[PDB]
Amino acid sequence: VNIEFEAYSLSDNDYDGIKKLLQQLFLKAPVNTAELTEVFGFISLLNLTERKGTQCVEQIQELVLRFCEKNCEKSMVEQLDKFLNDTTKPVGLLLSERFINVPPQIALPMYQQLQKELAGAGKCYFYLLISKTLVSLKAGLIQSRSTLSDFQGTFMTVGIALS
Amino acid sequence: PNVLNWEQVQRLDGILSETIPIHGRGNFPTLELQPSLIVKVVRRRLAEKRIGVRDVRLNGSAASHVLHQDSGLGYKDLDLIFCADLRGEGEFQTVKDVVLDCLLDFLTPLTLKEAYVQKMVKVCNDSDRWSLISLSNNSGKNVELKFVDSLRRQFEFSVDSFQIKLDSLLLFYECSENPMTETFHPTIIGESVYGDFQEAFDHLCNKIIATRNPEEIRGGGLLKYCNLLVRGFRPASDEIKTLQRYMCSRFFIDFSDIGEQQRKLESYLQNHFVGLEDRKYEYLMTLHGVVNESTVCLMGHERRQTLNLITMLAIRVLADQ
């Protein structure tokens, strides 16, 4: 099951609003210090078990379909707050339970191999990414090859926040 | 029958040969693109990549315009469907690459993408295996290239449920000289999602609404229904009580909070109402009318706080001249 979304007609204020919405999730996440060896977002390994897996895909696909409306650029951030930061939402809970913000040296490799899976042609990955170079809110849920099998585990959301 | 008459055919040629602005964001060179040119070349480069197109169709406000100009559904959105057989994960990538190999001719794929593309959504799930590209325009006019392999049923009104197969017309475009007259006119077949094209068009003629798949009624279905209601599309349905109960219920389920309601009505007033003024206030009062008269399971305090959210917004419209 692939679901891939790309939106580039976003306002600079919509970029900052999602950046702030994303960074509040970063505050809710413990940092990996002294344990290991513009893009803003998270990459979450989502095992497709019939329970937590199906419920999350339900919520993710529903939001994506909700974003296919005629314009909806304003209601994007409101829907995003009530989606990735709310209660009884299988996705927001996933983003509250096992979330880790990681330093650049770890995060870049993930954004790189993620980019290659979405462009070249296993583990299920749920991602959301905003990049400014040009706004590019790219999100999805794609069956791919391993991106961070070393540090990532099942239902562990890795935070990618770089410059 | 299903075959379009001449005037319809001429109007079809109209909205497909008349150019659209591809407004410039980032990369600023705007692009005057004729829809017929994109539809042709997209179909061509797709069949050339051996993808196998079944039909290229037109949907929504546009098809309802070529069939009967009288009805309120105004041609303000060009919705283009590419019914095909896309199953491989790479088939969606080469569809992407075709549309981007087309928009370079009319002037690197990644850069052109990041410039003028509003959305790129692909869904490969249990029944939906479709892809969509929305080209951007500052005037709000939206062009949607939808490549749909398989798509689930959806809540469909009669007069919005129209699809016209542009393939017989496409042939006339690749001939050097477009050989079109009243005598040499391509037999173009119109179709409907709601059901019998004879039924559905008659609904379009004399301003009737009727639904199918009410099981898939969405949250905002109530909002769009009043848009038909404000456009003179009176429901001849004497089953309208159930229908109105059906859509009100889902609106307050999907948007339970009052603040979440205000955001939806503020957005629907903002986007779905363009070039309309008394329509906005009329729309708000007809929504009021449907809620107060038809809903039947809103709590006491919830009913008032919603109805009064409508009246506040109607004051905002009145206060703006």
PDB file of N, CA and C in Angstrom, chain A residues 11-78:
ATOM      1  N   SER A  11       1.933  28.729   1.035  1.00  0.00           N
ATOM      2  CA  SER A  11       2.410  30.046   1.418  1.00  0.00           C
ATOM      3  C   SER A  11       3.552  29.935   2.427  1.00  0.00           C
ATOM      4  N   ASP A  12       4.388  30.979   2.464  1.00  0.00           N
ATOM      5  CA  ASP A  12       5.495  31.014   3.418  1.00  0.00           C
ATOM      6  C   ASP A  12       5.002  30.960   4.856  1.00  0.00           C
ATOM      7  N   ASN A  13       3.849  31.572   5.135  1.00  0.00           N
ATOM      8  CA  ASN A  13       3.269  31.470   6.468  1.00  0.00           C
ATOM      9  C   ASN A  13       2.780  30.055   6.758  1.00  0.00           C
ATOM     10  N   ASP A  14       2.269  29.352   5.742  1.00  0.00           N
ATOM     11  CA  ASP A  14       1.879  27.957   5.935  1.00  0.00           C
ATOM     12  C   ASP A  14       3.093  27.084   6.222  1.00  0.00           C
ATOM     13  N   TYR A  15       4.224  27.383   5.578  1.00  0.00           N
ATOM     14  CA  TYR A  15       5.471  26.695   5.893  1.00  0.00           C
ATOM     15  C   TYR A  15       5.860  26.896   7.352  1.00  0.00           C
ATOM     16  N   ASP A  16       5.898  28.152   7.798  1.00  0.00           N
ATOM     17  CA  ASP A  16       6.297  28.437   9.171  1.00  0.00           C
ATOM     18  C   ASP A  16       5.314  27.833  10.165  1.00  0.00           C
ATOM     19  N   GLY A  17       4.022  27.852   9.834  1.00  0.00           N
ATOM     20  CA  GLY A  17       3.033  27.298  10.743  1.00  0.00           C
ATOM     21  C   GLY A  17       3.200  25.807  10.952  1.00  0.00           C
ATOM     22  N   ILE A  18       3.533  25.080   9.885  1.00  0.00           N
ATOM     23  CA  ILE A  18       3.772  23.646  10.008  1.00  0.00           C
ATOM     24  C   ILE A  18       5.124  23.376  10.652  1.00  0.00           C
ATOM     25  N   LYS A  19       6.123  24.214  10.359  1.00  0.00           N
ATOM     26  CA  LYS A  19       7.404  24.128  11.058  1.00  0.00           C
ATOM     27  C   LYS A  19       7.220  24.250  12.568  1.00  0.00           C
ATOM     28  N   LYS A  20       6.452  25.252  13.002  1.00  0.00           N
ATOM     29  CA  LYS A  20       6.171  25.411  14.424  1.00  0.00           C
ATOM     30  C   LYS A  20       5.362  24.235  14.959  1.00  0.00           C
ATOM     31  N   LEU A  21       4.340  23.807  14.217  1.00  0.00           N
ATOM     32  CA  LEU A  21       3.570  22.635  14.622  1.00  0.00           C
ATOM     33  C   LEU A  21       4.468  21.407  14.737  1.00  0.00           C
ATOM     34  N   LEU A  22       5.440  21.277  13.828  1.00  0.00           N
ATOM     35  CA  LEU A  22       6.359  20.144  13.868  1.00  0.00           C
ATOM     36  C   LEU A  22       7.319  20.248  15.043  1.00  0.00           C
ATOM     37  N   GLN A  23       7.777  21.460  15.357  1.00  0.00           N
ATOM     38  CA  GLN A  23       8.773  21.619  16.406  1.00  0.00           C
ATOM     39  C   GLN A  23       8.185  21.483  17.804  1.00  0.00           C
ATOM     40  N   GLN A  24       6.875  21.685  17.964  1.00  0.00           N
ATOM     41  CA  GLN A  24       6.233  21.355  19.232  1.00  0.00           C
ATOM     42  C   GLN A  24       6.301  19.857  19.496  1.00  0.00           C
ATOM     43  N   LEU A  25       6.157  19.048  18.443  1.00  0.00           N
ATOM     44  CA  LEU A  25       6.357  17.609  18.569  1.00  0.00           C
ATOM     45  C   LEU A  25       7.799  17.274  18.926  1.00  0.00           C
ATOM     46  N   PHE A  26       8.752  18.090  18.473  1.00  0.00           N
ATOM     47  CA  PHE A  26      10.153  17.864  18.814  1.00  0.00           C
ATOM     48  C   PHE A  26      10.403  18.096  20.299  1.00  0.00           C
ATOM     49  N   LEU A  27       9.706  19.073  20.891  1.00  0.00           N
ATOM     50  CA  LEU A  27       9.827  19.309  22.325  1.00  0.00           C
ATOM     51  C   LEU A  27       9.285  18.135  23.133  1.00  0.00           C
ATOM     52  N   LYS A  28       8.275  17.442  22.613  1.00  0.00           N
ATOM     53  CA  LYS A  28       7.702  16.271  23.265  1.00  0.00           C
ATOM     54  C   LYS A  28       8.550  15.017  23.089  1.00  0.00           C
ATOM     55  N   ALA A  29       9.753  15.136  22.535  1.00  0.00           N
ATOM     56  CA  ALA A  29      10.568  13.983  22.199  1.00  0.00           C
ATOM     57  C   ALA A  29      11.899  14.030  22.938  1.00  0.00           C
ATOM     58  N   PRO A  30      12.325  12.931  23.555  1.00  0.00           N
ATOM     59  CA  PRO A  30      13.662  12.890  24.154  1.00  0.00           C
ATOM     60  C   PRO A  30      14.757  12.831  23.098  1.00  0.00           C
ATOM     61  N   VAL A  31      15.878  13.492  23.403  1.00  0.00           N
ATOM     62  CA  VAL A  31      16.991  13.644  22.470  1.00  0.00           C
ATOM     63  C   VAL A  31      18.039  12.577  22.750  1.00  0.00           C
ATOM     64  N   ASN A  32      18.708  12.126  21.689  1.00  0.00           N
ATOM     65  CA  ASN A  32      19.673  11.025  21.754  1.00  0.00           C
ATOM     66  C   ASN A  32      21.074  11.605  21.907  1.00  0.00           C
ATOM     67  N   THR A  33      21.493  11.806  23.152  1.00  0.00           N
ATOM     68  CA  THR A  33      22.784  12.405  23.452  1.00  0.00           C
ATOM     69  C   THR A  33      23.761  11.334  23.924  1.00  0.00           C
ATOM     70  N   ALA A  34      24.965  11.337  23.342  1.00  0.00           N
ATOM     71  CA  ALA A  34      26.067  10.469  23.766  1.00  0.00           C
ATOM     72  C   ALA A  34      25.666   8.994  23.749  1.00  0.00           C
ATOM     73  N   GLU A  35      24.901   8.605  22.733  1.00  0.00           N
ATOM     74  CA  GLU A  35      24.428   7.233  22.625  1.00  0.00           C
ATOM     75  C   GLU A  35      24.810   6.651  21.273  1.00  0.00           C
ATOM     76  N   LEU A  36      24.893   7.509  20.263  1.00  0.00           N
ATOM     77  CA  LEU A  36      25.154   7.093  18.895  1.00  0.00           C
ATOM     78  C   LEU A  36      26.662   7.082  18.633  1.00  0.00           C
ATOM     79  N   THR A  37      27.046   6.815  17.388  1.00  0.00           N
ATOM     80  CA  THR A  37      28.447   6.818  16.966  1.00  0.00           C
ATOM     81  C   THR A  37      29.201   8.088  17.378  1.00  0.00           C
ATOM     82  N   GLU A  38      16.750  23.321   3.714  1.00  0.00           N
ATOM     83  CA  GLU A  38      15.918  23.224   4.910  1.00  0.00           C
ATOM     84  C   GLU A  38      14.900  22.095   4.800  1.00  0.00           C
ATOM     85  N   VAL A  39      14.968  21.132   5.718  1.00  0.00           N
ATOM     86  CA  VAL A  39      14.013  20.031   5.783  1.00  0.00           C
ATOM     87  C   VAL A  39      13.544  19.881   7.220  1.00  0.00           C
ATOM     88  N   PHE A  40      12.237  19.708   7.399  1.00  0.00           N
ATOM     89  CA  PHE A  40      11.647  19.555   8.724  1.00  0.00           C
ATOM     90  C   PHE A  40      10.558  18.499   8.642  1.00  0.00           C
ATOM     91  N   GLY A  41      10.644  17.469   9.476  1.00  0.00           N
ATOM     92  CA  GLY A  41       9.619  16.446   9.465  1.00  0.00           C
ATOM     93  C   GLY A  41      10.020  15.233  10.278  1.00  0.00           C
ATOM     94  N   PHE A  42       9.263  14.154  10.069  1.00  0.00           N
ATOM     95  CA  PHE A  42       9.473  12.902  10.780  1.00  0.00           C
ATOM     96  C   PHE A  42       9.288  11.728   9.830  1.00  0.00           C
ATOM     97  N   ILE A  43       9.940  10.616  10.164  1.00  0.00           N
ATOM     98  CA  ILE A  43       9.827   9.359   9.430  1.00  0.00           C
ATOM     99  C   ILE A  43       9.525   8.268  10.442  1.00  0.00           C
ATOM    100  N   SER A  44       8.419   7.558  10.244  1.00  0.00           N
ATOM    101  CA  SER A  44       7.899   6.633  11.245  1.00  0.00           C
ATOM    102  C   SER A  44       7.763   5.246  10.634  1.00  0.00           C
ATOM    103  N   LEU A  45       8.439   4.262  11.227  1.00  0.00           N
ATOM    104  CA  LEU A  45       8.330   2.877  10.777  1.00  0.00           C
ATOM    105  C   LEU A  45       7.036   2.297  11.331  1.00  0.00           C
ATOM    106  N   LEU A  46       6.108   1.965  10.441  1.00  0.00           N
ATOM    107  CA  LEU A  46       4.746   1.589  10.805  1.00  0.00           C
ATOM    108  C   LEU A  46       4.489   0.158  10.336  1.00  0.00           C
ATOM    109  N   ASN A  47       4.713  -0.816  11.218  1.00  0.00           N
ATOM    110  CA  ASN A  47       4.371  -2.198  10.900  1.00  0.00           C
ATOM    111  C   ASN A  47       2.876  -2.321  10.637  1.00  0.00           C
ATOM    112  N   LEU A  48       2.523  -2.958   9.522  1.00  0.00           N
ATOM    113  CA  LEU A  48       1.123  -3.029   9.122  1.00  0.00           C
ATOM    114  C   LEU A  48       0.380  -4.166   9.816  1.00  0.00           C
ATOM    115  N   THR A  49       0.488  -4.248  11.142  1.00  0.00           N
ATOM    116  CA  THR A  49      -0.367  -5.153  11.900  1.00  0.00           C
ATOM    117  C   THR A  49      -1.825  -4.731  11.758  1.00  0.00           C
ATOM    118  N   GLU A  50      -2.727  -5.710  11.846  1.00  0.00           N
ATOM    119  CA  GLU A  50      -4.140  -5.435  11.606  1.00  0.00           C
ATOM    120  C   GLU A  50      -4.728  -4.427  12.588  1.00  0.00           C
ATOM    121  N   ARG A  51      -4.036  -4.125  13.686  1.00  0.00           N
ATOM    122  CA  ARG A  51      -4.548  -3.173  14.662  1.00  0.00           C
ATOM    123  C   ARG A  51      -3.981  -1.779  14.432  1.00  0.00           C
ATOM    124  N   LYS A  52      -2.901  -1.440  15.143  1.00  0.00           N
ATOM    125  CA  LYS A  52      -2.343  -0.092  15.062  1.00  0.00           C
ATOM    126  C   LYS A  52      -1.993   0.293  13.631  1.00  0.00           C
ATOM    127  N   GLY A  53      -1.566  -0.671  12.821  1.00  0.00           N
ATOM    128  CA  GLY A  53      -1.273  -0.409  11.428  1.00  0.00           C
ATOM    129  C   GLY A  53      -2.472   0.083  10.646  1.00  0.00           C
ATOM    130  N   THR A  54      -3.547  -0.710  10.631  1.00  0.00           N
ATOM    131  CA  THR A  54      -4.722  -0.353   9.840  1.00  0.00           C
ATOM    132  C   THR A  54      -5.340   0.957  10.315  1.00  0.00           C
ATOM    133  N   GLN A  55      -5.414   1.158  11.632  1.00  0.00           N
ATOM    134  CA  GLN A  55      -6.002   2.385  12.156  1.00  0.00           C
ATOM    135  C   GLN A  55      -5.243   3.613  11.677  1.00  0.00           C
ATOM    136  N   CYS A  56      -3.911   3.543  11.655  1.00  0.00           N
ATOM    137  CA  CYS A  56      -3.131   4.694  11.219  1.00  0.00           C
ATOM    138  C   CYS A  56      -3.338   4.978   9.739  1.00  0.00           C
ATOM    139  N   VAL A  57      -3.325   3.937   8.900  1.00  0.00           N
ATOM    140  CA  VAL A  57      -3.536   4.138   7.467  1.00  0.00           C
ATOM    141  C   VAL A  57      -4.925   4.711   7.207  1.00  0.00           C
ATOM    142  N   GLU A  58      -5.927   4.246   7.959  1.00  0.00           N
ATOM    143  CA  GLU A  58      -7.247   4.873   7.931  1.00  0.00           C
ATOM    144  C   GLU A  58      -7.139   6.383   8.098  1.00  0.00           C
ATOM    145  N   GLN A  59      -6.437   6.818   9.145  1.00  0.00           N
ATOM    146  CA  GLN A  59      -6.359   8.238   9.456  1.00  0.00           C
ATOM    147  C   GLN A  59      -5.511   8.987   8.434  1.00  0.00           C
ATOM    148  N   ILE A  60      -4.404   8.387   7.987  1.00  0.00           N
ATOM    149  CA  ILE A  60      -3.534   9.067   7.028  1.00  0.00           C
ATOM    150  C   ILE A  60      -4.238   9.233   5.688  1.00  0.00           C
ATOM    151  N   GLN A  61      -4.825   8.156   5.166  1.00  0.00           N
ATOM    152  CA  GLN A  61      -5.503   8.272   3.881  1.00  0.00           C
ATOM    153  C   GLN A  61      -6.692   9.220   3.964  1.00  0.00           C
ATOM    154  N   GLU A  62      -7.385   9.247   5.106  1.00  0.00           N
ATOM    155  CA  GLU A  62      -8.513  10.160   5.244  1.00  0.00           C
ATOM    156  C   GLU A  62      -8.059  11.610   5.154  1.00  0.00           C
ATOM    157  N   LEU A  63      -6.939  11.947   5.801  1.00  0.00           N
ATOM    158  CA  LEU A  63      -6.420  13.309   5.701  1.00  0.00           C
ATOM    159  C   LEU A  63      -5.996  13.641   4.278  1.00  0.00           C
ATOM    160  N   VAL A  64      -5.330  12.705   3.601  1.00  0.00           N
ATOM    161  CA  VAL A  64      -4.874  12.959   2.237  1.00  0.00           C
ATOM    162  C   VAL A  64      -6.065  13.251   1.333  1.00  0.00           C
ATOM    163  N   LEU A  65      -7.097  12.409   1.417  1.00  0.00           N
ATOM    164  CA  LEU A  65      -8.320  12.650   0.659  1.00  0.00           C
ATOM    165  C   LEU A  65      -8.948  13.985   1.048  1.00  0.00           C
ATOM    166  N   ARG A  66      -8.881  14.332   2.335  1.00  0.00           N
ATOM    167  CA  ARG A  66      -9.346  15.628   2.808  1.00  0.00           C
ATOM    168  C   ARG A  66      -8.531  16.776   2.229  1.00  0.00           C
ATOM    169  N   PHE A  67      -7.307  16.509   1.777  1.00  0.00           N
ATOM    170  CA  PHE A  67      -6.462  17.538   1.185  1.00  0.00           C
ATOM    171  C   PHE A  67      -6.630  17.645  -0.321  1.00  0.00           C
ATOM    172  N   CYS A  68      -7.373  16.733  -0.934  1.00  0.00           N
ATOM    173  CA  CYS A  68      -7.609  16.781  -2.367  1.00  0.00           C
ATOM    174  C   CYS A  68      -8.739  17.728  -2.738  1.00  0.00           C
ATOM    175  N   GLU A  69      -9.191  18.549  -1.794  1.00  0.00           N
ATOM    176  CA  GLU A  69     -10.231  19.522  -2.075  1.00  0.00           C
ATOM    177  C   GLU A  69      -9.682  20.614  -2.996  1.00  0.00           C
ATOM    178  N   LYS A  70     -10.579  21.494  -3.448  1.00  0.00           N
ATOM    179  CA  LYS A  70     -10.245  22.389  -4.554  1.00  0.00           C
ATOM    180  C   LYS A  70      -9.076  23.314  -4.228  1.00  0.00           C
ATOM    181  N   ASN A  71      -8.919  23.717  -2.967  1.00  0.00           N
ATOM    182  CA  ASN A  71      -7.807  24.596  -2.625  1.00  0.00           C
ATOM    183  C   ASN A  71      -7.237  24.237  -1.258  1.00  0.00           C
ATOM    184  N   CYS A  72      -8.043  24.390  -0.208  1.00  0.00           N
ATOM    185  CA  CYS A  72      -7.763  23.880   1.141  1.00  0.00           C
ATOM    186  C   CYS A  72      -6.371  24.251   1.662  1.00  0.00           C
ATOM    187  N   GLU A  73      -5.708  25.256   1.080  1.00  0.00           N
ATOM    188  CA  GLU A  73      -4.393  25.636   1.591  1.00  0.00           C
ATOM    189  C   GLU A  73      -4.482  26.285   2.963  1.00  0.00           C
ATOM    190  N   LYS A  74      -5.602  26.934   3.272  1.00  0.00           N
ATOM    191  CA  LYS A  74      -5.750  27.538   4.591  1.00  0.00           C
ATOM    192  C   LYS A  74      -6.037  26.479   5.649  1.00  0.00           C
ATOM    193  N   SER A  75      -7.030  25.624   5.399  1.00  0.00           N
ATOM    194  CA  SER A  75      -7.405  24.577   6.343  1.00  0.00           C
ATOM    195  C   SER A  75      -6.350  23.487   6.478  1.00  0.00           C
ATOM    196  N   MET A  76      -5.192  23.634   5.833  1.00  0.00           N
ATOM    197  CA  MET A  76      -4.145  22.627   5.957  1.00  0.00           C
ATOM    198  C   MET A  76      -3.614  22.562   7.383  1.00  0.00           C
ATOM    199  N   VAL A  77      -3.180  23.704   7.918  1.00  0.00           N
ATOM    200  CA  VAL A  77      -2.504  23.700   9.210  1.00  0.00           C
ATOM    201  C   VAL A  77      -3.482  23.361  10.328  1.00  0.00           C
ATOM    202  N   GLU A  78      -4.713  23.877  10.252  1.00  0.00           N
ATOM    203  CA  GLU A  78      -5.731  23.500  11.233  1.00  0.00           C
ATOM    204  C   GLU A  78      -5.953  21.994  11.232  1.00  0.00           C
TER     205      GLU A  78
END
